[PDB]
């Protein structure tokens, strides 16, 4: 479980690039499971940035 | 698009990861090479048509 920028959701799959797949979260190439994500702007954004 | 600019590129390092991280673009399609492998390969020239 974690929060990220919507553009960066692409980085969460087996075999990816950019800061997450570089460091922040790494899947194995043969992952047996599911990825789920949702926009959370109402909770996780704030007028002065979160 | 008829007068399309054939810019030859040579003698340079290309951080093609810029084109992945610049997610503002509507596409980053590839043929014959995977977009990851661009960051490892080297070419005699490139053409940025």
From Swiss-Prot, chain A:
Binds to host ACE2. RBD also interacts with the N-linked glycan on 'Asn-90' of ACE2. Cleavage of S generates a polybasic C-terminal sequence on S1 that binds to host Neuropilin-1 (NRP1) and Neuropilin-2 (NRP2) receptors. Interacts with host integrin alpha-5/beta-1 (ITGA5:ITGB1) and with ACE2 in complex with integrin alpha-5/beta-1 (ITGA5:ITGB1). May interact via cytoplasmic c-terminus with M protein. May interact (via N-terminus) with host bilirubin and biliverdin, thereby preventing antibody binding to the SARS-CoV-2 spike NTD via an allosteric mechanism. Changing residue 7 to N: In strain: Omicron/BA.2, Omicron/BA.2.12.1, Omicron/BA.2.75, Omicron/BA.4, Omicron/BA.5, Omicron/BQ.1.1, Omicron/XBB.1.5, Omicron/EG.5.1; complete loss of interaction with host integrins. This is Spike protein S1. The gene is S. Attaches the virion to the cell membrane by interacting with host receptor, initiating the infection. The major receptor is host ACE2. When S2/S2' has been cleaved, binding to the receptor triggers direct fusion at the cell membrane. When S2/S2' has not been cleaved, binding to the receptor results in internalization of the virus by endocytosis using host TFRC and GRM2 and leading to fusion of the virion membrane with the host endosomal membrane. Alternatively, may use NRP1/NRP2 and integrin as entry receptors. Residues 5-7 are annotated as: Integrin-binding motif. Changing residue 46 to T: In strain: Omicron/BQ.1.1. It comes from Severe acute respiratory syndrome coronavirus 2 (2019-nCoV).
């Amino acid at each position: 479980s974690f929060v990220i920028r919507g553009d960066e959701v692409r980085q969460i799959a087996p075999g990816q690039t950019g800061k997450i797949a570089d460091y922040n979260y790494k899947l194995p190439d043969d992952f047996t499971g599911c990825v789920i994500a949702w926009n959370s702007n109402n909770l996780d954004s704030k007028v002065g940035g979160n | 698009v008829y007068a399309w600019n054939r810019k030859r590129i040579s003698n340079c390092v290309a951080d093609y990861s810029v084109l992945y991280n610049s997610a503002s673009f509507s596409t980053f399609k590839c043929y014959g090479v995977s977009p990851t492998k661009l960051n490892d390969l080297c070419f005699t020239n490139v053409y940025a048509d």
